[PDB]
JSON list of C-alpha atoms in Angstrom, two decimals:
[
{"chain": "A", "resi": 16, "resn": "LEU", "atom": "CA", "xyz": [0.33, 0.18, -0.21]},
{"chain": "A", "resi": 17, "resn": "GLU", "atom": "CA", "xyz": [0.94, 4.00, -0.62]},
{"chain": "A", "resi": 18, "resn": "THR", "atom": "CA", "xyz": [2.43, 5.72, 2.40]},
{"chain": "A", "resi": 19, "resn": "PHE", "atom": "CA", "xyz": [2.40, 8.89, 3.03]},
{"chain": "A", "resi": 20, "resn": "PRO", "atom": "CA", "xyz": [3.85, 11.20, 5.84]},
{"chain": "A", "resi": 21, "resn": "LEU", "atom": "CA", "xyz": [1.60, 12.20, 9.12]},
{"chain": "A", "resi": 22, "resn": "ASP", "atom": "CA", "xyz": [0.45, 15.52, 7.92]},
{"chain": "A", "resi": 23, "resn": "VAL", "atom": "CA", "xyz": [-0.88, 14.26, 4.59]},
{"chain": "A", "resi": 24, "resn": "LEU", "atom": "CA", "xyz": [-3.04, 11.85, 6.07]},
{"chain": "A", "resi": 25, "resn": "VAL", "atom": "CA", "xyz": [-4.64, 14.39, 8.81]},
{"chain": "A", "resi": 26, "resn": "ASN", "atom": "CA", "xyz": [-5.14, 16.62, 6.07]},
{"chain": "A", "resi": 27, "resn": "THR", "atom": "CA", "xyz": [-9.17, 16.40, 6.48]},
{"chain": "A", "resi": 28, "resn": "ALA", "atom": "CA", "xyz": [-10.06, 18.26, 3.08]},
{"chain": "A", "resi": 29, "resn": "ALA", "atom": "CA", "xyz": [-10.96, 15.68, 1.26]},
{"chain": "A", "resi": 30, "resn": "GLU", "atom": "CA", "xyz": [-10.24, 16.78, -2.13]},
{"chain": "A", "resi": 31, "resn": "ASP", "atom": "CA", "xyz": [-6.24, 16.74, -0.99]},
{"chain": "A", "resi": 32, "resn": "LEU", "atom": "CA", "xyz": [-5.91, 13.29, -0.55]},
{"chain": "A", "resi": 33, "resn": "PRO", "atom": "CA", "xyz": [-4.41, 11.27, -2.45]},
{"chain": "A", "resi": 34, "resn": "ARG", "atom": "CA", "xyz": [-5.71, 8.35, -4.83]},
{"chain": "A", "resi": 35, "resn": "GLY", "atom": "CA", "xyz": [-3.53, 5.60, -2.76]},
{"chain": "A", "resi": 36, "resn": "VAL", "atom": "CA", "xyz": [-5.07, 6.28, 0.35]},
{"chain": "A", "resi": 37, "resn": "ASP", "atom": "CA", "xyz": [-8.27, 4.58, 1.84]},
{"chain": "A", "resi": 38, "resn": "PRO", "atom": "CA", "xyz": [-9.77, 7.56, 3.55]},
{"chain": "A", "resi": 39, "resn": "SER", "atom": "CA", "xyz": [-11.49, 5.12, 5.79]},
{"chain": "A", "resi": 40, "resn": "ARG", "atom": "CA", "xyz": [-8.58, 3.38, 6.85]},
{"chain": "A", "resi": 41, "resn": "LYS", "atom": "CA", "xyz": [-6.48, 6.48, 6.94]},
{"chain": "A", "resi": 42, "resn": "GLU", "atom": "CA", "xyz": [-3.97, 4.12, 9.64]},
{"chain": "A", "resi": 43, "resn": "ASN", "atom": "CA", "xyz": [-3.21, 1.59, 7.08]},
{"chain": "A", "resi": 44, "resn": "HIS", "atom": "CA", "xyz": [-1.50, 4.10, 4.78]},
{"chain": "A", "resi": 45, "resn": "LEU", "atom": "CA", "xyz": [1.09, 5.51, 7.96]},
{"chain": "A", "resi": 46, "resn": "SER", "atom": "CA", "xyz": [4.75, 3.90, 7.76]},
{"chain": "A", "resi": 47, "resn": "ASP", "atom": "CA", "xyz": [5.31, 0.65, 10.17]},
{"chain": "A", "resi": 48, "resn": "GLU", "atom": "CA", "xyz": [7.18, 3.20, 12.11]},
{"chain": "A", "resi": 49, "resn": "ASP", "atom": "CA", "xyz": [5.02, 5.99, 11.84]},
{"chain": "A", "resi": 50, "resn": "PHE", "atom": "CA", "xyz": [1.93, 3.44, 12.98]},
{"chain": "A", "resi": 51, "resn": "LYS", "atom": "CA", "xyz": [3.95, 2.52, 15.96]},
{"chain": "A", "resi": 52, "resn": "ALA", "atom": "CA", "xyz": [4.60, 6.24, 16.60]},
{"chain": "A", "resi": 53, "resn": "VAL", "atom": "CA", "xyz": [0.62, 7.08, 16.68]},
{"chain": "A", "resi": 54, "resn": "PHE", "atom": "CA", "xyz": [-0.68, 3.83, 18.07]},
{"chain": "A", "resi": 55, "resn": "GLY", "atom": "CA", "xyz": [1.83, 1.95, 20.52]},
{"chain": "A", "resi": 56, "resn": "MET", "atom": "CA", "xyz": [0.26, -1.07, 19.51]},
{"chain": "A", "resi": 57, "resn": "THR", "atom": "CA", "xyz": [0.52, -3.21, 16.75]},
{"chain": "A", "resi": 58, "resn": "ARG", "atom": "CA", "xyz": [-1.56, -3.17, 13.65]},
{"chain": "A", "resi": 59, "resn": "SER", "atom": "CA", "xyz": [-3.31, -6.07, 14.54]},
{"chain": "A", "resi": 60, "resn": "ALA", "atom": "CA", "xyz": [-3.75, -5.55, 18.04]},
{"chain": "A", "resi": 61, "resn": "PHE", "atom": "CA", "xyz": [-5.40, -1.93, 16.39]},
{"chain": "A", "resi": 62, "resn": "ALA", "atom": "CA", "xyz": [-7.21, -3.88, 13.89]},
{"chain": "A", "resi": 63, "resn": "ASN", "atom": "CA", "xyz": [-8.93, -6.84, 15.35]},
{"chain": "A", "resi": 64, "resn": "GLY", "atom": "CA", "xyz": [-10.44, -4.66, 18.76]},
{"chain": "A", "resi": 65, "resn": "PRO", "atom": "CA", "xyz": [-14.14, -3.52, 17.91]},
{"chain": "A", "resi": 66, "resn": "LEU", "atom": "CA", "xyz": [-14.55, -0.44, 15.03]},
{"chain": "A", "resi": 67, "resn": "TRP", "atom": "CA", "xyz": [-15.83, 1.99, 17.65]},
{"chain": "A", "resi": 68, "resn": "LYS", "atom": "CA", "xyz": [-12.78, 2.02, 19.19]},
{"chain": "A", "resi": 69, "resn": "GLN", "atom": "CA", "xyz": [-10.74, 2.05, 16.04]},
{"chain": "A", "resi": 70, "resn": "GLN", "atom": "CA", "xyz": [-13.03, 5.24, 15.09]},
{"chain": "A", "resi": 71, "resn": "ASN", "atom": "CA", "xyz": [-12.47, 7.14, 18.58]},
{"chain": "A", "resi": 72, "resn": "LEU", "atom": "CA", "xyz": [-8.68, 6.47, 18.53]},
{"chain": "A", "resi": 73, "resn": "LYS", "atom": "CA", "xyz": [-8.49, 7.32, 14.90]},
{"chain": "A", "resi": 74, "resn": "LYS", "atom": "CA", "xyz": [-10.51, 11.35, 15.97]},
{"chain": "A", "resi": 75, "resn": "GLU", "atom": "CA", "xyz": [-7.70, 11.57, 18.71]},
{"chain": "A", "resi": 76, "resn": "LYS", "atom": "CA", "xyz": [-5.13, 11.24, 16.09]},
{"chain": "A", "resi": 77, "resn": "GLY", "atom": "CA", "xyz": [-6.70, 13.44, 13.16]},
{"chain": "A", "resi": 78, "resn": "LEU", "atom": "CA", "xyz": [-7.16, 9.84, 11.27]},
{"chain": "A", "resi": 79, "resn": "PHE", "atom": "CA", "xyz": [-10.33, 9.46, 11.15]}
]
């Protein structure tokens, strides 16, 4: 998957978001390094928790 810097991904102007980002799964488009820095858990731990908690966390991070 295409990865992008955090500032690009937390840009909430939809028209600006690069085509290569799933707007509903922005966390998938952080590098592994940035995923750890932003969330502090494995991708699996995040993805396998309930969607509401995923969304709540992403709102805090600017990634919802």
